Design a protein around this ligand. Structure first.
Ligand SMILES: NC(=O)C1=CN([C@@H]2O[C@H](COP(=O)(O)OP(=O)(O)OC[C@H]3O[C@@H](n4cnc5c(N)ncnc54)[C@H](O)[C@@H]3O)[C@@H](O)[C@H]2O)C=CC1
Ligand SMILES: NC(=O)C1=CN([C@@H]2O[C@H](COP(=O)(O)OP(=O)(O)OC[C@H]3O[C@@H](n4cnc5c(N)ncnc54)[C@H](O)[C@@H]3O)[C@@H](O)[C@H]2O)C=CC1
Ligand SMILES: NC(=O)C1=CN([C@@H]2O[C@H](COP(=O)(O)OP(=O)(O)OC[C@H]3O[C@@H](n4cnc5c(N)ncnc54)[C@H](O)[C@@H]3O)[C@@H](O)[C@H]2O)C=CC1
Ligand SMILES: NC(=O)C1=CN([C@@H]2O[C@H](COP(=O)(O)OP(=O)(O)OC[C@H]3O[C@@H](n4cnc5c(N)ncnc54)[C@H](O)[C@@H]3O)[C@@H](O)[C@H]2O)C=CC1
Ligand SMILES: [Ca+2]
Ligand SMILES: [Ca+2]
Ligand SMILES: [Ca+2]
Ligand SMILES: [Ca+2]
Lengths: 333, 333, 333, 333
């Protein structure tokens, strides 16, 4: 009569997952921002866990769980989970890789176009009461807006989102380069893109750089005071991937000195983001969104139902065979 | 030793046009917003005129000119000039149709994506100090953001910009319809688009309506209290064409009642636009830009040099034969 | 009780048109290749005519009709009808411009790919018993086959078919140029194509030239011994437009001397075409189809029903107001 | 003073590879179709081997080599090499995956269009002396030609070539499905394609099926008398992948009975192919090419130089670390 316990760590709404898990698991929520906010009953008894990106799990946090057997990220990125240590401790880790691919690529194009066309900043200026009566004033208030055709878009990481962004960028006349040191040669040919070997070549040729790679152990602060100086003078930066990829200290100074003309960020080193705190406090030409590139109503529901199904499959079947999107089979023992 | 006079009516900067017209015409500027601000010497002697969109010329204004022989719009739209009366009075009228086609389509896609992805509004909320720490809060602050694939984009006017917008929209998964009662049948087939016969059919099937037609004598307030009720509940409206095409009274009420979920406007019935005056004072979910969809540095220079060349051709050669973009040959006599 | 007479001049099958015209017109067929094969009753009484491309109507032929009031081409091209003289004689002339736009563009791409990839010729060689056992033999038998990406496709005439061909060619990595002296500037920008001013520039830069213009009074033998020498050495020629556009004498010699590497022709100066007669008797590297680029079952039915509707509209209503695709309103009096 | 020996097994031309390998290896050729035609000196001393697709290497053949340390396929497919046994015997096996991706996709589109548009068959009929004078005769001779827009293209294997084919097919109005049981979910979203789970679903919904998968131990005769009956009545089949994927016995009967309207094959169960021998002797509506989809001059040179570089890297450096495209690291010991 006793069912396994499944806990939603960093959230409270479990409505979407309930119809899928009802006869399979007891569902609880912790609304927790850190391991320190999880009830002892969860740490002791929880067999499965559902979590988003707002809580981090180190080996230290993972060891506090005594019965945990699977974690499912309701989302694609899993940089916030110590994946190797989880596998060592016998804990499967899964993600939901496909629900928000095109939502995120559309948000990226929106940010790219917002930098080239300055629509967001032009809207601000009108809210700020700027009067734009003459053509000379239009040119002034829209100064910096640029023609897109012929510009070079450099994509770092050509996966699901990177490929979706590349196909969209081609429609606006962008010349699309990409740097992805983990793909085998020939993907540039299938999609009709130009590829480059080193990050430096990408940054050297790109008028606008957009990040679409996972945050892993080898690319923290991939954009830093060193690689920032490799970018074109007056280039754009876009990041809907992970804030850990950008040294905001170096970015702030680049915006202030004009080396980088503008930047659009949906993710940040420390989230939630605030224009009043952080290295970007006073950085100019800065567009930011609160980690919402992923969100649509259909994407939210899609990933939550898929996450719930993965939980069911883990409880009902055999780990890790029954799992569709386990990302640490190599480490599981 | 005496050269013809050419006047820049609603502007002062003539730097781009000077090298082209130096040995051909004396160049003056009026920096005028209305006919009432033009020096008598210009009205009497001016043989050619260069103007943008910030001044209107009625038959009354046109009759005040005694020597005028050609007007050149530095831009594509010429709804601000009485074209038939100008032809009656023997005044050629030309435009520059191609300089900003893709700048304007890129601005349109930026506004479309800004409505579907709410990037602009999400940026505002962060400037307003909203804290978005949890996923529930992300869903809340980004409420309304929608998946684009499967959505129907309805294009009113499938000319230079409309076609550029259609090709771009297809890359995001839009289903593209268009209504253009002046094209012959078969253009929908060449570009792989679906066409509809009546404005009502366009509005009935479209999740997002975007205007790309000229403002002519038959489509003032094309969007009005009658046709607004023909649009889908919760649809988007985009207008980078002409503000005269939209009854802002009807639009404001539709935004307030939620019939229209959001609207992005680069043009307005009365320009310059102000969020503090007009029928849109208090309208919600409203994005606006100060008639800047056209602007890039390369587009501004391109159209100004082309405009200057048209002036040269008029003075040097025969009107209207030597003109490349005269838009009123039928009326000229 | 007496209905108007409508005659299918160069055909016999009227099944598709009958349900549309039953209560409107008496339908007869002539199965005629020339005016000399039309029954006197048709010449005297026929009020409307339906015809394809296999019969020509000069002023001489048109004058033999005494009651004719409208001709409808079941197809887009109407170069086989003296359009000006028909208008002089009070005879409306209409076409069906849209039924086969994409069928014809698909046939064109098939011919283009058949030249670059030599699939057709490679199939012939296998029917001829050629044994291709080694790689050296594959290279030999497929000699001439070329990589498409980077190649320049030059389009002459950027209308319905030309635009459909341009969009398809871009997907294969072609660089697309076009020459069309009748379009206003700005269409190259909407579709993201490069335009050229003179036929010579088109031929000078193109690795493969494809014809998509109407045959009019100013472009007979557009490709001739003079303009053929303006083409790139070893270029391809494709013609699914009209055979009258190409001087086959000049073409034959160019194929024989290797100046042109290969040619694909769906239309010819004299049709039907035969590899045993004509200036192309012995021309090498020649692919030909019997004027079938237009044909699909859905296209044949679509244009025949549309043609029948145009006939109905002419009889039932007022000429030329009620006509949707009259191509000689300027001449009708 | 003694260099390693490198042998071109199934070819004689080594000109492209010589400048790259001169100071690294002694180069010989065998022009051999089977292991039985290789000189004893090669079998004993050869340290490296270059081969195409015209010779097969079983464990039996591999064991005859005494010094062989690396095999390099000048091409992407390596189904003709026992890869597991080669790794067991300590023999690295590499391929060249990218040189002909777009050549092969262009050949595939040529075959697809040749079936839908019947250009090849229409050319044959003209060579056979068929006279096509009337429209009724055009419809007759081109019977079977079909409109492409709305048709469903089913891709089996969505790798380098499959993706290139998908993007091209979208430009013609195809609805593109694909079946690839080895990809993780989310690739359909990045490229805007519809995916299906089982081969049966692919065949059930597709008007035209095209094969783009490797020939492996689990898909020999993937198209067989069982799966052929799962295809749509009157569907098309295209195969530029591997002939071993199709049971030609089942295919022949399907063409004869009309279940399959037509088939285009660049590869065959037994190559070289002959219309006079094999299960396809008398099959109708059959287009064939002699395994030439890969060939362009630039592709041939590109893959041969890359192959030579891989050989150099193997001799000069450490196996398998220094290899860029080793396809059997898992088996090498
Ligand atoms: N802001 C948001 O709400 C969302 C953020 N994302 C983020 O966007 C990123 C991309 O997501 P997907 O495309 O689904 O991931 P994916 O796994 O499909 O693709 C990631 C690609 O990045 C490449 N990569 C890894 N390290 C790299 C490096 N140092 N340099 C260049 N390339 C590298 C990999 O080879 C891989 O191809 C992820 O980090 C994910 O967290 C994704 C969706 C929504
Ligand atoms: N905000 C800005 O800075 C810019 C605004 N524009 C405006 O955008 C509009 C489109 O410009 P282009 O594409 O260059 O014009 P265009 O002349 O190339 O195309 C206009 C099309 O609209 C169609 N049309 C006219 N009346 C219509 C109606 N009642 N319903 C449906 N279709 C109708 C015409 O048939 C024509 O095909 C113009 O009004 C122009 O003023 C253009 C560029 C920049
Ligand atoms: N083989 C077949 O069964 C078929 C043949 N066709 C032919 O293909 C041709 C194109 O058809 P559509 O695209 O429907 O015609 P369209 O009227 O849509 O376009 C024709 C274009 O050619 C341009 N043009 C005219 N003379 C020119 C010259 N000297 N140089 C460059 N451009 C020139 C015009 O400006 C126009 O834009 C027609 O001649 C038609 O007869 C069309 C369909 C099927
Ligand atoms: N005729 C010619 O000259 C040429 C032939 N080819 C052939 O075309 C085929 C594709 O080549 P690439 O795209 O470079 O290979 P690739 O390795 O890039 O892609 C192969 C794809 O097929 C999939 N696949 C494997 N077995 C499958 C099955 N049973 N059902 C569905 N999908 C399956 C794999 O998941 C993989 O994604 C190869 O077999 C190759 O030999 C390639 C180039 C030229
Ligand atoms: Ca720049
Ligand atoms: Ca909606
Ligand atoms: Ca060449
Ligand atoms: Ca069918």
């Amino acid at each position: 009569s006793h069912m396994p316990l499944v806990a939603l760590l960093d959230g409270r709404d479990c409505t979407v997952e309930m119809p899928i898990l009802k006869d399979v698991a007891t569902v609880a929520f912790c609304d927790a921002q850190s391991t320190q906010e999880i009830h002892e009953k969860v740490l002791n008894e929880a067999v499965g866990a559902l979590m988003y990106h707002t809580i981090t799990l180190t080996r230290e946090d993972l060891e506090k769980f005594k019965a945990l057997r699977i974690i499912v990220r309701i989302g694609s990125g899993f940089d916030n989970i110590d994946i190797k240590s989880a596998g060592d401790l016998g804990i499967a880790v899964c993600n939901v890789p496909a629900a928000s691919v095109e939502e995120t690529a559309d948000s990226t194009l929106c940010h790219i176009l917002n930098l080239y066309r300055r629509a967001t900043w032009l809207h601000q200026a009108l809210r700020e009461g700027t009067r734009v009566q003459s053509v000379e004033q239009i040119r002034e208030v829209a100064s910096g807006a640029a023609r897109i055709r012929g510009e070079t878009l450099g994509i770092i990481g050509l996966g699901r989102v990177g490929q979706a962004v590349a196909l969209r960028a081609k429609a606006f006349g962008f010349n699309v380069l990409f740097y992805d040191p983990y793909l085998s040669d020939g993907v540039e040919r299938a999609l009709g893109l130009q590829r480059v070997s080193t990050l430096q070549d990408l940054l050297f040729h790109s008028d606008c750089v957009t990040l679409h790679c996972g945050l892993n152990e080898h690319n923290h602060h991939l954009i830093n005071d060193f690689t920032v100086k490799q970018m074109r003078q007056g280039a754009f930066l876009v990041n809907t991937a992970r804030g850990g990829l950008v040294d905001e200290k170096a970015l702030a100074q680049a915006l202030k000195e004009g080396r980088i003309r503008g930047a659009a960020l949906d993710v940040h080193e420390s989230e939630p983001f605030s224009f009043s705190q952080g290295p970007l406090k006073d950085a100019p030409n800065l567009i930011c969104t609160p980690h919402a590139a992923w969100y649509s109503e259909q994407a939210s529901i899609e990933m939550r139902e898929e996450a719930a199904r993965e939980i069911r499959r883990a409880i009902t079947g055999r780990i890790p065979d029954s799992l569709k999107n386990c990302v640490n089979k190599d480490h599981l023992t």
